Amino acid sequence: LPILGVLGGMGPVVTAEFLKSIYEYNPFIDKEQESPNVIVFSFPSAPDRTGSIDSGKEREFIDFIQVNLEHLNKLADCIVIGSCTAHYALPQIPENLKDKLISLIKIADQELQEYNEPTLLLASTGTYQKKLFQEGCTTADLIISLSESDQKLIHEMIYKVLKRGHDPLSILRDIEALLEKYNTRSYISGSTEFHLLTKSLKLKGIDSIKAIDPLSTIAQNFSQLII
Amino acid sequence: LPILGVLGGMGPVVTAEFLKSIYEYNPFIDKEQESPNVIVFSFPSAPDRTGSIDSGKEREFIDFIQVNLEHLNKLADCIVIGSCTAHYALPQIPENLKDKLISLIKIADQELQEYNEPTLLLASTGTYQKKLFQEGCTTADLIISLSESDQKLIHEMIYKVLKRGHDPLSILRDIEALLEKYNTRSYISGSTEFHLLTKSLKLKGIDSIKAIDPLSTIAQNFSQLII
Ligand SMILES: N[C@H](CC(=O)O)C(=O)O
Ligand SMILES: N[C@H](CC(=O)O)C(=O)O
């Protein structure tokens, strides 16, 4: 049977919610033996991703990712890292451990190709600084980049609201204002913590915003993707 | 840093919710590097626990638990199995793999000693048949056992409602009626799926019922228990 391995804890709140999403979107028909097999390493003790970018101890962070990829390579058939920012480590990791990896950057890119409309990349300054989406996406011309001022406001939303488990709907007004400002009906979850907002919107039946949210997509399409 | 290993997927819905509970009840102060480190094996492909009791393939089920305990023994400092029923396998597993194990039966027993009032064991027929609580708890005289008719109604709640992810509050009326019938203000989560009801009650501020719910307790007391 096909096993998904999640290297998560980045942050833990969204890591936990992602696991809920998997079984929410893959309900069983008769017996729960049908349902997805998943291994989660929720290690919040990973050194902060955006924090490690402003240090010589990117090295420390890349080691974290490498050792845990070694462990999960032995245990899982596909792997996901529960942080977009964290994908910056991948050029330093040997090609063999990235064999099973399913990139959140690539998943985002596939969705955006199908959607084919300008879309606002909501992400941390560190994700922006590492230019993961602009360098990684075939659809980069459809990505609207936040200004530096708005990047910091998003960083503030992620850390002061979403990572601390507060109601993701509490930032919806600020987000509609950004979408309205940058003149788009659509966002990319450049930070995985926007999985939490994506869920709260779907739950509330707000279908006016189009979320390109890789963790949602991985959950929805678990049967097809994991083999 | 201290790592909790969860052998779960039994069922997956409650396994996912338990991981949410851990970070809900252990919010970080400044940085999320503070937060709990957890490994989850959510394998719903485990053969049904109550189902395996009515077969010669208890053997198949005990092997599942043993191999996964071997894996988690190498990776974690404490282990929990996310099924009460599943604890029936433990007499067959060698003492060395049970070193790190934190029994849900024992955790329930500790809580009930402190509470010290008659309490209704809500559980599957298979948990009842294996007599895990009556044989395992020092406080067994405080446990009120369901009749066989009511055991089947609970089995129906677990499988038709809670395991399929439906609103745990949808069974609250039926549960108040059982507590009222057996003349008590208190239940034991003999099935782990009653973690889901315990959460939905705490969220709704219903403090009239006292839940002896081991997964809640493990989450609340993560710092103290995990070392
Ligand atoms: N939430 C992660 C960054 C992190 O907090 O590690 C991301 O995808 O951007
Ligand atoms: N939910 C489990 C039984 C199971 O479904 O495996 C229990 O604790 O009873």
B195 close to B21: Cβ distance less than 8 angstroms: yes
Report which ligand 1 atom has the smallest distance to the Cα of A86.
6
Find out whether A125 and A205 touch, Cβ atoms under 8 Å.
no
The C-alpha atoms of residue A191 and residue A102 are separated, in whole angstroms, by: 16
Residues of B in contact with A33 (CB under 8 A): 44-48
* B20 has a chain A CB within 8 A of its CB: yes
Tokens of A42: 């929720």
d(CA B12, CA A110): 29
Question: Read out DSSP for chain B?
Answer: --EEEEEE-SSHHHHHHHHHHHHHSS--SS-GGGSPEEEEEE-TTSPPHHHHHTSSTHHHHHHHHHHHHHHHHHH-SEEEES-SGGGGGTTTS-TTTTSSB--HHHHHHHHHHHH-S-EEEE--HHHHHHTHHHHH-TTGGGEEEPPHHHHHHHHHHIIIIITTT--GGGGHHHHHHHHHHTT-SEEEESSTTHHHHHHHHHHTT--SSEEE-HHHHHHHTHHHH--
- For the Cβ of B139 lying below 6 angstroms from any atom of ligand 2, the answer is no
Contact B165 A36 (CB under 8 A): no
- Number of the ligand closest to the Cα of A188: 1
8 A C-beta contact, residue B17 and residue B92: no
Shortest-distance Cα residue to atom 6 of ligand 2: B10
Q: Is B154 exposed, middle or buried (0-12, 13-18, 19+ CB in 10 A)?
A: buried
All residues of chain A having their beta carbon less than 8 Å from the beta carbon of residue B3 are 43
Return the residue in A20, A32, A85 with the most chain B beta carbons within 10 A, the one to mutate for interface testing.
A32
A163 labeled binding residue: yes
| Residue A9 falls in which region: left (phi positive, over 0), alpha (psi -120 to 50) or beta | left
CA A159 – ligand 1 centroid, Å: 10
Round to whole Å and give the CA distance between A4 and A7.
Answer: 10
Residue type, A144: I
| Sign of the alpha-carbon dihedral angle for B74, B75, B78, B80 | negative
B85 lines ligand 2 (CB under 6 A): yes
Q: Taking the CB of residue A193, how many other CB atoms lie within 10 A of it?
A: 28
Select from A17, A34, A164 the Cβ nearest to the Cβ of B27: A164
Contact status, residue A48 vs residue B48, Cβ threshold 8 Å: no
Neighbours of B204 (CB within 10 A): 10
Q: What backbone torsions phi and psi does residue B126 show, to the nearest 5 degrees?
A: -70, -35
**What was the structure determination method?**
X-ray
Ligand 2 atom showing the smallest separation from residue B83 Cα: 8
For residue B11, is the peptide bond before it cis, meaning its omega torsion is within 30 degrees of 0?
yes
How many CA atoms does the CB half-sphere of A10 hold within 13 Å? 24
Domain ranges of chain B: 1-105+215-227, 106-214
Atom of ligand 1 nearest to the CA of A123: 9
Rounded CA separation B149/A55 (Å): 64
Q: Are A127 and A169 in contact (CB under 8 A)?
A: no
Is A85 part of any known ligand binding site?
A: yes
* DSSP string of chain A, one letter each residue: --EEEEEE-SSHHHHHHHHHHHHHSS--SS-GGGSPEEEEEE-TTSPPHHHHHTSSTHHHHHHHHHHHHHHHHHH-SEEEES-SGGGGGTTTS-TTTTSSB--HHHHHHHHHHHH-S-EEEE--HHHHHHTHHHHH-TTGGGEEEPPHHHHHHHHHHIIIIITTT--GGGGHHHHHHHHHHTT-SEEEESSTTHHHHHHHHHHTT--SSEEE-HHHHHHHTHHHH--
d(CA A130, CA B138): 58
What tokens does A67 get? 């050792």
If you measure CA to CA, which chain B residue comes closest to A9? B37
Structure-token pair, residue A54: 């402003």
- Determine contact, residues A168/A161, Cβ cutoff 8 Å: yes
Instruction: State the helix-helix crossing angle for A148-157 and A172-181, rounded to 10 degrees.
Output: 160
**Strand A37-42 to B37-42 pairing:** antiparallel
Q: What is the resolution of this structure in A?
A: 2.8
Rounded Cα distance, A11 and A93, in Å = 21
B16 touches chain A (CB under 8 A): yes
Structure tokens at B60: 């198949």
